[PDB]
Amino acid sequence: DSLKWIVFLLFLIVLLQLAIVFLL
Amino acid sequence: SLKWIVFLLFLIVLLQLAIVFLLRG
Amino acid sequence: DSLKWIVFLLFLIVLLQLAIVFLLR
Amino acid sequence: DSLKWIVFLLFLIVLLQLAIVFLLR
Amino acid sequence: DSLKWIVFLLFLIVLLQLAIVFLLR
DSSP states (O other): OHHHHHHHHHHHHHHHHHHHHHHO | OHHHHHHHHHHHHHHHHHHHHHHHO | OHHHHHHHHHHHHHHHHHHHHHHHO | OHHHHHHHHHHHHHHHHHHHHHHHO | OHHHHHHHHHHHHHHHHHHHHHHHO
C-alpha cells in the first residue's frame, strides 16, 4: 500500500542524509 | 492524497541522490 | 485538512531541494 | 494526534532547509 | 503501526538536518 512505500521512502531519505553527513 | 505524498517523496529521493552526486565531486 | 498541509510542505521541500542543488552546482 | 505531529516535523524540516540554503549562500 | 514509523523517521530526518547544519556552520 501507500503507507509502506512512504515508510520505505523515508528510510531511504534517512540513508541519503547519512551519506550526505559522511561526504561533508 | 497518498499518491501525491509518494510521488513527492520519490522526487525528494531523486534530489537527495543528485545532492550526493554533487557532493562527491 | 492535515493531508493538504503535508502535501504542500512536501512540495516546498522539493523546491528547497532544487534550490540546494542549484547552489551546489 | 499523529497527523499534527507530522505537520510540525515537516515544518521543522522546511525551516532547517531554509537555514541550509542561507548557510550555503 | 506505520504512522508511528513515519513519525520516528521524520524525527530522524530532523536530527540529521540538525547535524548537517552543525557541520555546515
